[PDB]
Amino acid sequence: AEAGITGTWYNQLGSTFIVTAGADGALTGTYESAVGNAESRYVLTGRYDSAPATDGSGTALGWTVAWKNNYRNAHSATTWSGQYVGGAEARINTQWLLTSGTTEANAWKSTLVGHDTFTKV
């Protein structure tokens, strides 16, 4: 819990997430997706709540990735919100929101929602 977040994680789609959790709640790393208008690693930044409760709970965290890198600009950003749980098999369970930049005309259809489970396997 708290700790253990640092490392390389993978989700059901094959995307890889490499993060560093800092003593004071920062989350920094890079994201390589398996889907979308993605081509390479993207920078990610987030926060995690460094003093989780001392009961059998997971650690809340969230992060963002703007899908723009030296290779692609998909004019969109994804944020994942979820919680980290450790143990023999640690995972991060998240729900995400992906918003694309649209014209007002298409604003009603700008956000996709999904879920992802990351493991270090």
Residues near Cl ion (CB under 5 A): 15, 33
Shortest Cβ 118–a second copy spacing (Å): 14
Return the residue of 8, 40, 114, 119 that touches a second copy, per CB under 8 A: 114
Return the residue of 51, 88, 89, 121 that touches a second copy, per CB under 8 A: 51
Does residue 116 touch ligand NH4 according to CB under 6 A? yes
> Within 10 A of 14 (CB to CB), how many other CB atoms are there?
10
Angstrom distance (rounded) from CA 40 to CA 86:
28
Q: After which residues is the chain broken (C to N over 2.5 A)?
A: none
> Residue 17 in contact with residue 11, Cβ under 8 Å?
yes
Question: Looking at the DSSP assignment, which residues form a beta bridge with residue 85?
Answer: 91
| Binding-site annotation: residue ranges for biotin | 31, 42, 80, 96, 108
List residues near a second copy by CB under 8 A. 13, 24-27, 35-36, 43-53, 55-68, 73-83, 85, 93-104, 107-115
